[model samples]
Target chain A: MKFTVEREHLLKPLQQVSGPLGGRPTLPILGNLLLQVADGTLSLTGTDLEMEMVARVALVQPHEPGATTVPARKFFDICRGLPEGAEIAVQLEGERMLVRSGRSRFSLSTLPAADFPNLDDWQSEVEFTLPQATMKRLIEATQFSMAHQDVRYYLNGMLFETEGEELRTVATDGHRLAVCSMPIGQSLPSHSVIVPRKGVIELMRMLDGGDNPLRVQIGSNNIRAHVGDFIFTSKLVDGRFPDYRRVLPKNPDKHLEAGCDLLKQAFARAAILSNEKFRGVRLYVSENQLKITANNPEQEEAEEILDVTYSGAEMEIGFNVSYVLDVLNALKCENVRMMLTDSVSSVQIEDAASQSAAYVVMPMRL
Target chain B: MKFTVEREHLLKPLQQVSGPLGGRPTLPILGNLLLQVADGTLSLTGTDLEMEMVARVALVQPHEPGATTVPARKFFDICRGLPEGAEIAVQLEGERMLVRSGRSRFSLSTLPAADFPNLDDWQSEVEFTLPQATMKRLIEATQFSMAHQDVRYYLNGMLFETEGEELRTVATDGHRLAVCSMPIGQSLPSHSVIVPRKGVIELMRMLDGGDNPLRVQIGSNNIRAHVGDFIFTSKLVDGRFPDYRRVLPKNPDKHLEAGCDLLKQAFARAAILSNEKFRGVRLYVSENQLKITANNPEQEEAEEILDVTYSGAEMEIGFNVSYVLDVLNALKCENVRMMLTDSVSSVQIEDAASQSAAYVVMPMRL
Candidate 1:
């Protein structure tokens, strides 16, 4: 089998296949990427059993059908080392593959392409199309809250809930939760799936802040997205996710609003002395002022004061400092609002003028 | 005792103190930095026992003499979190150090300053001044050849040789050697010292390419450099460095010259298929053409061809690919020369027009 392609045509598609690749390939073949060329199109696919990514490039001329698998990392390393925009020829003779460009030549070993695994055990239940920018925003605002390697299993992924022309992303680690919703224009039957941690992360990386349409398909055992020329798929976490609506704060009569940058800076300073293990930063809010304080076991302490507008009784609350900082950094808002009931209950936070994204933090014992 | 300093006064000094900090501090006090204020001057010092770095900042007003040691990482972390350009006040109360800036306050526990170990046993025997740029160039060109954690302890540090009016830096790991020389304006007593890897790296980090003068002092047991307002002191390695003069190729009857970028790119491409463990790249030079090739145990191979000016009979040699790449990267030259004798003899590389910096890479058995 033989084919020729320009370095430019393969670079982008090759990058899509090379992710923070899932991990130590469980099998030797899993470490390889399946490359197939047929009907004037070239496809590169990588799989780590649980997830798979396929990138397709349009070939200018018709090429005979052929398939083979080669070590992904070494394959890309050799191609990148070739001169930019150079036209390269690849040919397979026996179990060895050859790459030639000008006076440079590389010979690589390959495995039978038929050995590559495909996620064929699932069927799509619902499909939807949305702008890449909107999908990126939805994930960007909530993905960080996903639990990592937790025994709860289901929480180790982000919940993708679609219904009533709206798509929502929710992630939580028991102590904190982030929920972001966006209008999807077209309506379909309601469905929810937990996209595993690595899938959500890899999917987020593939998304760009562009208006190009991205097609998403949710299946019983897998979730997939098509962005540009790459197709991303991940096995769904097999447990039920916690009901986020029940976890959100209710009937919060107290409200406080403050400049996002001001509050973020003040909290960051006070957090310096927070207990390294507990990471608690105590907040005291009054009519038009807010005070933040933290102390560690070594008796080290930090305190800061910032001006804010409050319409509730004086109250004191303690929460994990990083949770608040994470929200503030993610929010694209000048002013942020915090709705609270008391020091013991959870607090809900959101953009001063938009309810599209909401964050919640459980009070700490500090 | 209390003193005030704007954040600007401490930022650069603080950066100098934070290196890729050597390693886990063996002692508690070693993890702290001694802060001393006297005669309207502030000095910050950190010591890992083997090395010490002290930075001095001038204070505007006279303050009573005071000294304390605070956790180095925490001390700097808090200062950085304060608003930029804010004036900060630091006061020592009993064993506690209080830092106040605007409405932000940080109180940290401190160990008695007397516990901070000082590199006071060494006495300088020679002192000289040279442009920081010259010193930086010498180290930058040779430092990468230093071995990391080699059994031959002296091979893990760079040798600083000063004789007549020339200062030279040399480093070698059994397989490769790099030597760079620059003429200092002032002559000093002949001296040889091994600057430990960490100290060399840190000093290189502190140096910029500007022509600002740097004062250097060489002692029997320690070497110290005063650049800007920061004083760097490092203990000399006790072992003796291998004689670099004997390692350099002498009777090189073969010479090949080529464009640096062209060879570098070609070599990089061929290196992809080099043995992962030995990293051997074979070179074949004949007439006016050069062909580089490499292969691994898996039978995978890569070859590249480049045009060059060669005055030697046809010959083939093999050396570690990375060593050649390192020299090419550090040699600030558009054209490079390779001086060689035979396939078994070591090869010497340098700028085609200048011999100030020469690199020797021993041939590999391939």
Candidate 2:
């Protein structure tokens, strides 16, 4: 393949695909990015067995239409180090890829394009579209609760459930749960898929805070997301996701509302004295006030009192301070609503103005 | 002690002193910061046995004069969590330090002041003063080369040497050396002391860009720096520093001057294909050009040729790319000068415009 492209034109596409390329791949070729030039366009593809990303851009000058695979990291690094506004010429020389810009040249070892593994199992069974901002919100609100390397395996991913016009995302780590949903304008059949944790993270990173529409296709074994000139595909987790709805709390006996910033600061203070291992903090709720207290084995204690809007049965509950802090940080609201029934029941946290996102924290026995 | 202080007045000082407070201190009292209220002033002191930091502020409201120790991290957190501009009232109530601000109250456990170890061995056998910015420059330019946990323990600190109206700081890790010096304008005696790595770091953090003068006193065992309202004392390394003068090159056979930015970028590009384990890059210097190349075990090669003004015997040398990058990053000059003799000699890198600071990097056999 021989093509001349602007340094800026190829940077973003290379960056998008190189995210999943591991430092040490099981197969050496798996560490490379497949570069192809055909019909006035150039495409870059990178995969890590579980996911694949491909990005395409129109070449400035296409001399010959061909294909090869070059080391993803080295190629990207060379392009990045080149002087800005420089024109980069890429050509395939036998089994090596020659990249030249200004007075710099790089001869990167290449593998045959036929050795690249493409994600061809994406049989689209359900298709839908949503604004990029909406999708970004759905992922950001729930992605933090996904489990890391859990034995259950299914909990290490996020559940994307769609029913007619309603689209919902839920993630839980058996301790805390996050759920967010939005209504797509178009109606669709009911479908559910669990996207692995890395996929959700990459998708969130790839999205921009714009009103542009993003098309999503769901399959029985894989899911694909297309935005602009980039396509991302990930294999679905075959295991079953736990019943997230049952874990969410319903109509509690007492509720309190407090300024988000005030509550976050109070929890942060109490966390300093909380047990280093358990990170447990106690919340004492009563008429018009919430008291936060934490103590470690060293006999040091921290207490904070905030004037919250609450007039209900007095109750004391314990929880991991970080869990509640995460929910507070994610919500951009003036006031946060917390509902509780007893010391042992999970507490519901949500924004009073919008019910699109809800978080539940299981109480700890401090 | 009983006193009231503004939250803003105490936050920075608490942060500065709490850096060295160990999470699990060798002695339980070492985890606590000694709080003393005497002569209408409140002082906070934290120590890690090897180093100590003390900050004092005039009390907003002085009621009693006494002393005690409270958990450094917890007290700082409580003060930090208080509302903006809040006035915190701290009192010694038996064995607890009662802290009250607005509606929040905390009763933190405290140890007797007698249990806190104080660095009272600062015998000022030599004293000097210099502008905070000047002292900051001397340390900042050389501190990065300090060794970490090396068996030659003295190499893990910076050598602070002073003569008549001259001050110098040097540090090295056997492979690379950095030296910087400045005229202090008022030096009395020639003295040398090795400030441990942590002390140099904390001192750098404490200094501001203002032109205020800082008083420094050196003793046989410890050194104390008095800057503004804070006093920092650190134990000396109690060993000899390598003779840095011998390491500096004189009248090298070959010298080259290049644009700092161009050289930095070229090295960064070649570094991509350099050996991952050795990080070796080859430089071929001849007439009017410098050719940089690097190849890894995978047979991938990167080359960059830069136009320069040179007419000397061609020389090929290998050096760790990161070492050259570090010197380039630290020097804020338009042009960088490199002096070398042959492939076996250490190269001297310095700013073309000034010789106040210089860096020497050992050659690596590629």
Candidate 3:
């Protein structure tokens, strides 16, 4: 675009919009970021058909407006390579674009902005405002359980459902499920949408404006998140998602509250001795002591006993140590409370201080 | 082994000696660390037959003296898993080893200590003491040029040679060469050895005793470094190294001085536009200014111009930006000086302040 801007102002937003270009674009224009200058702001858009990211930078003074699609990565590198605060001048000449800094100049081949595609038309069915901190936590607490490249494509994303005053996020890989919910300021109609795995990470990573509210709009087949100066849109994963409620334990009779860090350390150490293929570790709950034991095929065994308050029937259970460790580390609380019915049924884990997020890990047959 | 040692005292050395066990040992016993407690000290040894590392821990109280071999990774994890300063009691019970802490116990399968193999015997012909900082610098300056998995196996290691007054470290990957030398204080008989790539990294990484003199024993087939409580030994690559003196430009007729960081940054930025395969960049030196230009197959061109004091003939030279960047970045000085004869000849690079280390990179045809 024909504009003069400081190098520092364009580098950050350029990276955000160009992230979806991947390693190598299958299509030539897919590697280009649409650059358009209008109304005293420069708009940069990069998309891969599935998701689109657009970042706008306000110009201090209006200049001649122009539009073109240039190599996203090269344009970014030229900006990054230049010294900060250097006045960068850009202009489209014929079929190529020239980027000039203080004593540096880069000429890049360009594609017409008309070649850039936009997401299919979809109208918003649900509009809501979400706190940035809540959005960050919702992704952090539940994203680890999201299935990756599963046969059931819907399981590869996170589920967002609005229930009256509560907005919940759920993800599961069949064996484990994570559900986190936060209170919305106003009640909204029932609506559920599945955001693909890539979209979830992309949303949380760019949510840098903390404490600010993110205006979200979900359509039948698309979702859009609007933050400070960026608008992110992603096509929804359309398929049947597993009902996480059915996997979570109802009323587990055996319950225990274990120190979060202590349990994580124990499981981590015992993991070194667990069967490499099965990753099975035995957890024995008796009185107020929680003893863990794991042994590999080599006959090497590791044992750890931590003081965990339990007032139920003495029980033993086997589970994948990594799953338990994940839940414990993610809890972010001093004590982690777990509920288990027997050695075969799934276990329910939650923060001892709050139940805003719950984790369910299926037991492994050791 | 039968001994009680604090976790903090054992964990550091445990990782050093057990580093060579690798991901998966071909032999079962190769995964075990030889634990021997005799007199008042405990020695831990782990080897992959090519190299051996031994770390000795002095026990506060001499309990029962014994020896055995236990899984190197498991023992280390158990110690790492325990709290700092925990009294770790390890003893051979029956055919298995029992490691007991406050509320944790690990039973590991152990192979007899007698079954452990030692590196082939070799006697030191030239013994010398080198400062740890000097050794670290020697490895750091030259190791980057070592060839990786090349047919010329000798180029896959750094050559350590002792001159009449200096100890020199040299490495070359056929196209580029790095030579670094430091005064050894006292002159010794001439001896040279090539330490393999892995061995060089291992030696420098564990060289934590900075400023302290490292007592080195250079044998015909092996080199052993004794520092602090660690005794490290590695087999030498039995091949002749290239004559680095021939590669270094000798009293070049052309000379130029440039700021080290400025040159590095320029080359790094220009690299983004260089050809993906050759990484070629052209440097044009005229008067007191130097300009660099690079272009990729996509026809995207990047150019940078900086001030460099050059009174020689106007010249244009092509070189791999990465090689030039490496030398400039590694010089660790404010200004870098270069000597060259013409566009195709090898260029010599060294610190403008001091010439302790010199780099030679053959010109690339663009």
Candidate 4:
């Protein structure tokens, strides 16, 4: 394969695919990124067994229409270091590729393209469409709550449940839970799929804050999303996700509303006093006032009083300050609403104006 | 003890002494910092047996005079987090000190001041003075070359040698060495001392780039340097240094001059192909051109050629690219002069204008 591409044009695409090509690829061929040149377009692809990323380079000039696989990281590093706007000429010679850019030159060994692993499973997935902005917002609302390396296996991923025109995503680490529900303007064929941890992370990186809608395709055993010119695919986790609805508290006894910024700032300070292990914080709710306090093993106490709109009977609730802060920081709202019963029940946190995104925090005793 | 001081005033002194208080102290109390309040000055001192740092706050309004020792790291973190410009009130109540800064409060436990450790065998053996600028320049030039956690105990520290009217600082890490010398404007001491690794690091942090001269006092077992309101003391290393004079090339058969910035940048590019374990780069010099090349075990080769002022037979030398770049980047010169001896001996690298600051890098065979 022979092609000439601009320095910046290849730098960005290489970065996008490098995430999946981490050091120590499971298969020897998985460590290489296939550089394919055809007509006037070139594509760079990097993959592991579970996920694959492909970035297209349409601005480069091609001398010969062919394909080859080279070390992803090493090839990217050389192109990144070259001077800006410099045209890099890449030519394949036997098992090595000769790269010349600006005043420097590099001869890198390459693996055969036939030995490269491709995510052809994506072709079997059914394609669906959604706005890029909508998907990004959903992730922001619930990704952090996903369990990591959970022994249950099913809890180590995200659950996307869709039926007719409604879709809801839920993730829980057995301690805290986050749920985000959205309206899927078009019919989404009733189905539920579990996306592994790595898949969720890579999808978030590809979102790029663009408000344009994205086309998502869900296969029996795979999931795929096409963002602009990039194609991202990941294997679906095959495990049973516990019924999240049964875990959430229904008809909480009390609801308290307070400014989001004030609560986040106060919790950060009180968190310093919480135990390094449990991070247990106490909340005293009274007539229109919520007082938060925590005491560490060292007996150092931090407390703050915030004005709220609740006028319920006095209640003292315990919780991990860190988990609550995660919810506060993720929710885009002026005031956060807290629905609670007591120290033994789960407390649900959400934006007062909407229920599209809600956080359920398990109670703790101080 | 009771006193009220601004948060800013306490932060400055805490930042100074906390650096040298990391090593394990023989006595538990030595792990803490001694705080003494007498008249109107608040003195803070930290000692790790080998090095001692003392900083004083003079403008405090003292209501009581007393002394105590508190954990340095925890105290620093608390002071740093206090509200800016807030009047922090500290009072000893029983075994705990109550600190109230703004609306936030903390109670820190303190150890008895009588248990704090002190250096017992400190005697002044040599006393002299030198412009702080010259001392700072000497350290800045050779500090990076000092070995960190090297097996060679003596080579891990800095050597200070004084002869009549001049003082020189030398530091090496077996593979490379840096020497910086300057004539003392006013001197009355001839001595040699090896400053421990921790002491040299602390001294570098205390010295600022300016014109005020430092009062240097070398003790028989320790060295004291007073800069501004801080008194820095360090116990000397007892290991004998190797005769580095023999390593300096007497007459070079070839010399090359190149722009410091250009050479450094080109070396960085060539470093990409260097072996991960060896990090060895080959330099080929002939006439007026210099070429740098390195290859990984994968047969990936990185090569760059630079033009310089040279008129001699071709010579090839191998050295760690990182060491060469460190010297090139630190030298404050327009052009750098490189002296080589038939590829078998160490190559001398230094600024074109300053012979005092030079580095000798041992060559390696490819």
Candidate 5:
């Protein structure tokens, strides 16, 4: 393979795909990034068996069409470290790859492209497109609640579900649940898939906050996302996600409205003295006031009181301070509404203006 | 004791002293910051036996004169979390410290002030003052060469020496040595002290790049620095540092000058393919150009060439790429002068504009 490409054109695509191959890859060949030159486009691919990423850039001058795999990290580092706008020439000699630009040259060891295991081609049962901005928001709003390395493997990912024209994403750790929904035109067959944690994180990173269209394809065992010039594919978690709707709070007996910044700061302060193990903070809701209290085994205590619009009978509830803080941080609005029953039920928090995103936190016994 | 102070007034001093007390402290009281109120000044102190920092802020109102110790980290966090300009009211009740500001209140566990061990008053043999900027530059130029956890304990710190009106600092790890000097007005008795690695780091952190005057006192066992409203004292490493003057290259056969940024970038790129264990890079200096080459165990090689003006005999030398890069990064000059003797001798690097700082790195067999 022989090609000459601009440093700017190759650097971003190399970085986008190289992340999955870091830190002692499972197979030696997996440490190499597959490069294929065909026609006028040069494609770069990296995989760790479980997840794969492919990015392409148009070649200005293509001398020959061939395929090979070079050390992923070293090639990327060299491309990034070169002076901007330096034209890089890459050529394959036997099993070695030589990269030259300006007065710098690098000879990297390569593996046969046939040894690189690209993902098996799979056809999707359903496909859809959404504005990149809307897709980014949906993931950012609910991704934090996904469980990390849970025994119930299904909880370690986010559930993407569609019905008619409504698209929704839900994630829960059995402690807190996040649900976000948006309406998209031309929705087909209803289906749901659990995207593994790594795939969701990489997909989210690929998305830029813009109105550009992103196409997604859902298959039985794999999901693929195409954003701009990059194609991302990942194996889905083969387990059933819990019914997130059942965990969300219904009409509660008490409703309170408070400034988002004020509530977040109050929780952060109270959390300073909360039990390091449980991180439990008690909230006392009464007429026109919300009081937060936390204490540790060392006899240190922190209490915060905020003026809230609550006229319900006095009720005390306990929750993990971090969970409540996450909810407040994710909501972009100035004010938030909290719906609560007694001390034993889950609390629902929503943006005061747009009710597109909702969070449910299960109460803890302090 | 009771006092009311604006949150901003107390937060800076609290944060300044709390750093040395983080991680597992040897003594319980060492983890607490001592707050003392007397006359019209409120002082905060934190110590971890080896080093101690004290900062004072003027008090608006002083009702009583007393002292107590509050947990350093928690106290700082609480003070930082409070709203800006909030009038914080602090009072001592039994063994606890009660802090109230606006709608927030915290009761922190405290240790008896009497148990706090303060540094014993020591007499300094000589004292001098310098601009904070100059002092910062002196430390920053040479501190990076200090050895980390080496068997030679004295090499784990920087040597501060004085001769007549010249102030000099030197550090080395046997592989490379950095020496920096400046002219001071005050003539003092010639003395040398080894400031432990940690002390030099903390002292560097305390200095701001300004022309404000800083007074430094050299004592028998401790070095004290007074910069603005803060006082820093560090226990010196009790060992003999090597005579650094003997290692500096007096006259070299070859001299080469090159752009600092260009050489640094070349070294960085070549280093990408250097052996992970030795990190050796070969420099081939000829009549009018310099060439760099590095290779790893996999036979992967990188070469970088730069144009230069040289008329000496052709010479080849090897040095750790990172050491050369560090010297280049620290030198504040557009062009740098490299003095070389032979393949086995050390190479000296200095700014072409001034001879205030000098660096020497021992050659390696590649």
Candidate 6:
């Protein structure tokens, strides 16, 4: 393959595909990025079996079409540091990819692109379109709640499902579950896909809130999303996700609207005195008053009280302050509504002004 | 102990002593900061057996004098997050330190001041005064060259010694050395102290040009310099440092002068192609032109050329570009002068228009 591209033009694709090039992969080829130069364009592909990334860059001038898989990290590092606007010449010489820009030249050992493993093993496919902003927002709202090594393996990632016209993404770590949905302009085929935790995070970073529309497709065993110049693919988790609807409270009898900023600050200050291991924070809700208290083994107690218009029965509820703070911060609203059904039930939290999204968190023992 | 002090007053002492508390001393009390409150005055002291840092804070109310050492890290973390201007009431209760401000209260475990380590183990004491700016300049010039974990233990820190009437600080890491000096108002007994790596760094950060006079007392085994509210101390590295005067060439036969900014830019660009291991750069210099080349194992080379006026014989020298850039940047001057004697000897670098300081870095083979 022979191609010449400006430094700026190649940087984006290089970064997108390079993410999956994890160090010390079981197979040496997994550490390489497959490079294909064809039809006046350069294509780069990288994968770690579970998730794959592919990016394409069109060249201003092109020569012979060929393909190879070469070391991704070192190549990207060199190209990114080159002088701006410098033209880099890339070509396949035998099994090596020769790259030259300005006075710097590198000959990287390469593996033929034919040897790269393709994720064609997955069967069925589903296609849809989403504004990059909406997709990025869904990930931002809930990715943190995904479990890392949960015994219920299916809960270790985010679940994406389509209901008629609504696209929803949900993630839970048993203790808390965050779900957000948006209406798509077009309909997606009836399907549900579980994106393992790592894939969910990588997808979030790739889709910045750009104005361009992103094309998403889901297969029986794999899913792909195209953002900007990159096509990201991930193998779907096969296990069944827990029924998140059951975990969310059906109807909280007593509800209170709290100033989001005030609640966040109170929790932050009280958390400083919470136990490092369990991080339990006690919330005392009474007539017209909301108080937060946290105590550590050192006998240190931090308390903050703010007046709220709540006339419900008095109760002391415990919670992991971090969960409450996350929901409050992500809602992006001035006020938040919290639903309670006593001290033991899951707490329902949502933007006071919006019904589109809600967060459910388990309570801690005071 | 009973005292009421503002958050601002407590913050200064906590920040200054946090570093020394991290030292690996076997005694539990050595991990604490001694707090003494008396007659509307609070004195905070931190020691690492060999060095001690003390800062005094004026309080709003008078109190009986008492001394105790609270756990260092926890105390700092709590005090830093407290509300500004809040008068915190501190008292010793049993084995804990009770701190109360507004509705928040923290009881921190403490050790008796009697268990605190003594910081008076020094052989010789010397007194001198120098401009705060001069001390800061001397440290900044050579701080980065200090060796880390070198077998030559003494080279692991900066050497602060008196040469005639000038206060000189020198640091070297096998590859490169930085030397800087400033004239003192008066010299008492000529003495030298090797400030441990951490102490020299902490002291440098505490010093800045603000028309303040630096009072430095050099003890036999410890040196203390009071800069404004911060008191920095360190255990002198016991080993004797190499005689740096013999390493410096008596007469540098070749001289080159150029704008510091121009040379810095060229070095930064060339460094991108330097080998990750050796980090060496080749310089080709003639009467009116200078060229630099850096190459990595992959045979990638970065070359930069600059126009300079010089009447010296044609010469080619090998040196790390990063070392040259560091010295020029530290000089903080418009023009830079480099005195060279072939490629084997240490080179002298300083500001061409100022005679206040000098920087020396030994060359490396390309």
Instruction: Assess every candidate by TM-score.
Output: 0.98, 0.96, 0.98, 0.90, 0.98, 0.88
lDDT of 4 at A141: 85
Error of 4 at A184 (Å): 7.6
List the candidate 2 regions with Cα displacement exceeding 4 Å. A22-24
Worst 10 residues of 5 chain A by lDDT: A19-28
Evaluate all candidate structures by whole-model CA lDDT and list the values in order.
Answer: 0.88, 0.89, 0.88, 0.83, 0.90, 0.80
- RMSD of candidate 4 to the truth, in angstroms, is 3.3
- The per-residue C-alpha lDDT of model 2 at residue B41 equals 85
TM-score of chain B of each: 0.97, 0.97, 0.98, 0.94, 0.97, 0.92
DockQ: which is higher, 3 or 6? 3
lDDT tens readout by residue for model 4, B176-254: 8898889886565677888988888888788776665688888766899988788899988878776678878999978
Which is better, 3 or 4, measured by DockQ? 3
Encode model 4's per-residue lDDT on A1-366: one tens digit a residue: 788878878877898888887775667788888889886788888888789888888844537888899888778888877766888988998889888976688888888887788666435544567887788778778999998787988788998778678677889899999998888688777788898889988988888767666878888888888888888888999988877788778888799999888788778767766788989999999999888888887676676777899977898989999899999989869988999887688899999999888789888865
Model 5 lDDT per residue over B159-180, tens place: 9998888788999999999999
Poorly placed runs, candidate 6 (over 4 Å): A23-28, A62-64, A91-98, A104-107, A121-124, A322-332, B23-26, B61-64, B121-124, B184-189, B208-213, B250-366
Q: What are the candidates' C-alpha RMSDs?
A: 1.5, 2.0, 1.5, 3.3, 1.2, 3.7
How would you encode candidate 1's per-residue C-alpha lDDT over A40-126 as one tens digit per residue?
788999888888889988878546679998888888988887888898888888899899999999899999998888668678899
Q: Give the better candidate number (3 or 6) by TM-score.
A: 3
Error of 1 at B94 (Å): 1.3
In candidate 1, what are the lDDT values of residues B1-366, reduced to their tens digit? 678888988887887876635444768888788899887789999888888889999988546688999988888888887777888899998879999999988899999998888777778998889898888889889989999899999999999999888999999998899998899878778889998998898888778656668899999989999988888899999887888889887778999999998899999888888888889999999999999999989999999999999968998989999999999998878999999998889999999999899999999886
Cα error, candidate 5, residue B186 (Å) = 2.2
Tell me the tens digit of each residue's lDDT in model 6 across A230-257. Answer: 8898888989887777878887877887
lDDT digits (tens) for residues B155-271 of candidate 2:
999999997788999999999999998997784688898999988988888797777679999899889999889998889999989988899987886889999999999999999
lDDT of 2 at B199: 86
Task: State which candidate, 5 or 6, has the greater TM-score.
Answer: 5
